[PDB]
């Protein structure tokens, strides 16, 4: 392959005169050098006199995703290009190079060739691409005209703490290009505009609003109407005690970064469908095949589930049956969902496969004629339903080998029929108490209650706006009169808070008008808060029916206004492109994004190729770990990284874990791999532009699935923000962790730390370790850092139900900060309630080595209690967020029972006083159990 080999390769050259050359070149050779070697050989081949000079032509090749690629950048090495076959054609340089180059790079970047979208011959795909690519291109051009103030906000949005003493510690500042620097005094509560003016007084040769401050060694910029202490860097510097090094940068220099270009209700006949044939069915010949089918709107059925005759098992079963459902054509809601499941049964149960289908299409039209539904394999689960209505609408992309059900919807009229427009729905839709105390009682906390809420639906709108979701579920979606009345209320419904809107995005509310209302209430989000839920919102795309929806528009809108959100949107989508359920949908969004973000596209390109090399590097280390001992493998790992194609690819890129962090120069000697089942690579970095502790690491992990850990770290980060919003800083370490590919991700190395196993094993000892890292006066900071973190991670682990806690997956920083790692199991799994846990060794440190230190231990109890309390106040946020994560198909988060773990752990049913009394009893038995365990 190209990724590893340093040898030469025989390359086919096609000259534009029809002449053909065939000679060997180095895999490391760049395209400029190959064109020189080509011109030297072509001399002695026919028709040379008719060629223009080498600079008149561009190499074309067939790239790894089956598309033609104009290789315009000729500083790339042949190994980096990865042509399918080593074949290079010379063509004319002129043409529209911009569109052709972007399309090429988009294909290589999303891991799916754009031609595959065309191949489908789908109007919905073609309209989506047409609409979204223009919208994104429009936002990118509009961005490009705006000022350096606006552009710095897009490119490098502010990293502030949630948020204050007015103390003063000194600051180092410099200008761009100069060796010398000027240290001076500054208070914690100064505004950055003031800080620049101070620095601008260099001698007195002899204006500050022409500049911004940059944290040197990274893309983080201090600006705007915020004090110095609200920023993360200065706050990080002040807490650690370090002197912040900033850099003044000119408004002209920021522009240098910026300037890179680019009727139906009449039809009362009953709904039916013509089952015809099955194809490529793979079953036991002894049994017989049945096709169960049902209509759905979200979860609940619209009518009874019809079935077929027992036709005998083969590859190509034939039915030719009419299936008549108990519902009219006009009674069908907008989002009516026909759901099939092929079974294998004894003549007189085995679900073989399933497939869902929207009756109306993306342009509102009720579908007619034959459809070939390529089915998905049914996987058995604990709650084994007959049909799978929560599964995806999209076809199985394996059309060559996957089974399929051929059906045919009947022609209902000579003219086709759409679902009626909003105004026609609103038209037929306009048309103290005993009942008031009942409704209050139902909503403040079933078939009788459903019919009551329905009659009192207007009083729900007026007096119980936050109970919209309940009112939606009680609506009878199988009768079009009821549907219109509910949608009429929805259009005049008052705007709800973010929390309620998060509930409305779930699979239980499939109607577009509800989805549109949910997004409407999420437009009030800030980028920081939106980032706190970006993972959940991405997963909800997997419940969408049509490609072009309001949630895709929303996410693209926010991704184009904010580069950080765009960055993590990209990776959230990219890391699931291997999954055929979502490959098409995610592929189209990534395409739309890239077209609105050609600048960030160049950064993501570099990252993708680092990840590509690391995959190959880890595969080599995996193989050599089996073949040889580690020390020799560590050396053979280094020699592979010394290769220029590897070294340049791994060097000088923005980190996928944090795009503001720069990964400049690899420290090959410091690089290694961890002893673990998947042999994760430990890669270390360093940049001379940075200051103290500017030596970042990353962990490339291939083989395991890191989505589970990311969710856990997201939720710990969320807790930390909730706690920091009530002035409780618990010194957490919610480190970076990002899935990037197929069982592939990065994890942020936490510097100056070791596992508690290692500290205890190497020469009672935990407290001695902290003494060495915090001598004398410093030791008191370490214990408070320990106690605050120990409280937060005790509460965090309890709430999330994170089991398998032990010495080698609990770590401690040299600052004193405790933190947990490797969150492979959670919500009780390994299931059963994980108790609250206090460790004797941790309680020993907390008490400053003493047997009894009541004053300290009481404070630690206070931290645990206050932490636990704050999370209860925000309990519904955790449920709503977890409820949407059921979309992601994580094994340990798949149903209501997994959600029920959080309800019980946070005691959301019980009152606050009742919950606190139970928490103390859990705390107390944890304290008692701590003594008995260690013995």
């Amino acid at each position: 392959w190209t990724k590893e080999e340093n040898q030469s390769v025989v390359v086919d050259f096609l000259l534009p005169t029809g002449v053909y050359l065939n000679f060997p070149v180095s895999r490391n050779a760049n395209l400029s050098t190959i064109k020189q070697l080509l011109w030297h050989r072509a001399q002695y081949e026919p028709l040379f006199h008719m060629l223009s000079g080498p600079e008149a032509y561009v190499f074309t090749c067939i790239n790894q995703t089956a598309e033609q690629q104009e290789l315009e950048d000729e500083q790339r090495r042949l190994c980096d290009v990865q042509p399918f076959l080593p074949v290079l054609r010379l063509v004319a340089r002129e043409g529209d190079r911009v569109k052709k180059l972007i399309n090429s790079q988009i294909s290589l970047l999303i891991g799916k060739g754009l031609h595959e979208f065309d191949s489908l011959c789908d109007p919905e795909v073609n309209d989506f691409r047409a609409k979204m690519c223009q919208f994104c291109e429009e936002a990118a051009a509009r961005r490009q005209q705006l000022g350096w103030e606006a552009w710095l906000q897009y490119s490098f949005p502010l990293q502030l703490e949630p948020s204050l003493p007015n103390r003063a510690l000194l600051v180092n500042v410099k200008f761009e290009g100069s060796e010398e620097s000027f240290t001076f005094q500054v208070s914690t509560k100064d505004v950055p505009l003031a800080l620049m003016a101070c620095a601008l007084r260099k001698k007195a040769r002899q204006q500050p609003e022409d500049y911004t401050l940059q944290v040197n060694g990274r893309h983080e910029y201090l600006y705007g109407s915020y004090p110095l202490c609200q920023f993360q860097y200065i706050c990080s510097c002040l807490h650690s005690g370090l002197t912040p090094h900033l850099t003044m940068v000119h408004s002209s220099s920021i522009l240098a970064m910026r300037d890179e270009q680019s009727s139906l209700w009449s039809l009362e006949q009953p709904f039916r469908i013509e089952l015809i044939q099955g194809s490529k069915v793979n079953a036991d010949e002894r049994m017989k095949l049945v096709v169960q089918a049902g209509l759905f709107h979200g979860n609940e059925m619209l009518c009874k589930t019809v079935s077929s005759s027992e036709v005998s098992v083969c590859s190509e079963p034939v039915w030719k049956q009419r299936l008549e459902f108990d519902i009219n054509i006009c009674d069908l809601p907008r989002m009516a969902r026909l759901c099939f499941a092929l079974y294998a049964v004894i003549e007189k149960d085995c679900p073989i496969a399933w497939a869902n289908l929207m009756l109306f299409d993306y342009k509102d039209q009720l579908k007619t004629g034959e459809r070939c539904l390529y089915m998905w394999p049914s996987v058995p689960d604990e709650k084994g339903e007959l049909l799978n209505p929560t599964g995806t609408v999209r076809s199985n992309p394996n059309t060559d080998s996957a089974a399929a059900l051929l059906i045919c919807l009947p022609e209902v009229a000579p003219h086709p029929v759409y679902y009626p427009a909003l105004e026609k729905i609103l038209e037929l839709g306009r048309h103290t108490e005993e009942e008031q105390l009942q409704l209050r009682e139902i909503l403040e906390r079933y078939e009788h209650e459903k019919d009551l809420v329905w009659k009192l639906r207007h009083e729900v709108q007026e007096h119980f706006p936050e109970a919209l979701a309940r009112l939606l579920l009680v609506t009878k979606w199988n009768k079009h009169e009821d549907v219109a009345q509910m949608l009429y209320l929805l259009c005049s419904w008052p705007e709800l808070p973010v929390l309620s809107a998060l509930e409305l995005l779930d699979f239980s509310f499939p109607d577009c008008h509800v989805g549109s209302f949910a997004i409407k209430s999420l437009r009030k989000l800030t980028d920081d808060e939106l980032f706190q839920y970006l993972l959940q919102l991405v997963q909800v795309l997997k419940y969408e029916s049509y490609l072009d929806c309001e949630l895709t528009k929303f996410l693209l809108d926010r991704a184009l206004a904010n580069r950080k959100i765009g960055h993590f949107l990209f990776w959230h989508l990219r890391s699931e492109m291997h999954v055929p359920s979502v490959a098409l949908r995610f592929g189209l969004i990534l395409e739309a994004y890239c077209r609105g973000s050609t600048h960030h596209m160049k950064v993501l390109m570099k990252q993708g190729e680092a990840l590509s090399k690391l995959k190959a590097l880890n595969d080599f280390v995996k193989l050599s770990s089996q073949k040889t001992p580690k020390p020799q493998t560590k050396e053979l790992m280094h020699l592979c990284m010394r290769q220029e194609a590897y070294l340049e690819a791994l060097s000088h890129l923005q980190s996928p874990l944090d795009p503001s962090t720069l990964l400049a120069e690899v420290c090959v000697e410091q690089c290694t791999f961890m002893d673990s089942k998947m042999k994760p690579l430990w890669i270390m970095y360093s940049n001379e532009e940075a200051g103290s502790g500017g030596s970042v690491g990353i962990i490339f992990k291939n083989g395991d699935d890191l989505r589970q850990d990311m969710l856990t770290l997201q939720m710990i980060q969320l807790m930390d923000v909730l706690w920091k919003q009530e002035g409780l800083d618990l010194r957490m370490t919610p480190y970076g962790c990002l899935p990037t590919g197929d069982r592939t991700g990065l994890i942020e190395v936490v510097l100056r730390s070791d596992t508690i196993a290692n500290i205890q094993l190497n020469k009672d000892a935990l407290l001695n370790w902290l003494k060495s890292k915090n001598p004398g006066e410093a030791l008191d900071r370490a214990i408070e850092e320990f106690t605050l973190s120990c409280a937060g991670y005790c509460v965090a682990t309890y709430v999330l139900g994170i089991g398998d806690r032990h010495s080698d997956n609990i770590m401690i920083r040299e600052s004193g900060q405790l933190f947990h790692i490797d969150f492979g199991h959670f919500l009780g799994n390994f299931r059963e309630r994980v108790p609250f846990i206090l460790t004797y060794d941790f309680v020993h440190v907390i008490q400053q080595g003493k047997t009894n230190n009541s004053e300290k231990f009481e404070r630690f109890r206070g931290y645990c209690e206050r932490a636990y309390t704050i999370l209860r106040r925000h309990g519904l946020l955790f449920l709503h967020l977890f409820a949407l994560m059921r979309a992601a198909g994580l094994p340990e988060l798949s149903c209501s029972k997994d959600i029920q773990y959080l309800k019980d752990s946070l005691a959301l049913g019980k009152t606050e006083e009742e919950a606190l009394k139970h928490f103390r009893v859990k705390f107390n038995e944890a304290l008692r159990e701590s003594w008995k365990t260690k013995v």
Binding site: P16, G18, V19, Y20, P46, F84, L85, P380
Partner: protein, 169 residues
Amino acid sequence: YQQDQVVKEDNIEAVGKKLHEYNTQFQEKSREYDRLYEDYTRTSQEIQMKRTAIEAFNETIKIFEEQCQTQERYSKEYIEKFKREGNETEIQRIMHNYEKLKSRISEIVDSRRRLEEDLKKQAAEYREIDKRMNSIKPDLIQLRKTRDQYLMWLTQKGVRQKKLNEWLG
């Protein structure tokens, strides 16, 4: 005056002994299904990879067919133009260089052909993976229901959780 009988044994230890057996059989079948589902996904990914590579072979050949079309059109002038002024070198060099191009296409057609054979073979694997999986789902599901009926019987009878846990171990 009500009836339902899926439980075969009648004393608590005999039923709990059978709970352990059916649980152990269920986890073993679960493992066998999960093993096959990895093969299914891996094979599905590998087949997709091969189908993209076939398009890449097609698209390369397409480029070579375009080179032949150019060679035939473009050479037409010089072959005739240097027949008068007898440069039989030029003709012999050009036509051999064309024969050198044609010969390379046949290697690429062969390499495409070898891949199509693997995909046909691997498509037949995929179908046998799915065939094997579908003959395991009944056993798996029936073993899940039995395991649950036996647990229900023992719980109703009042058997303590510690006794249930040890059998499910």
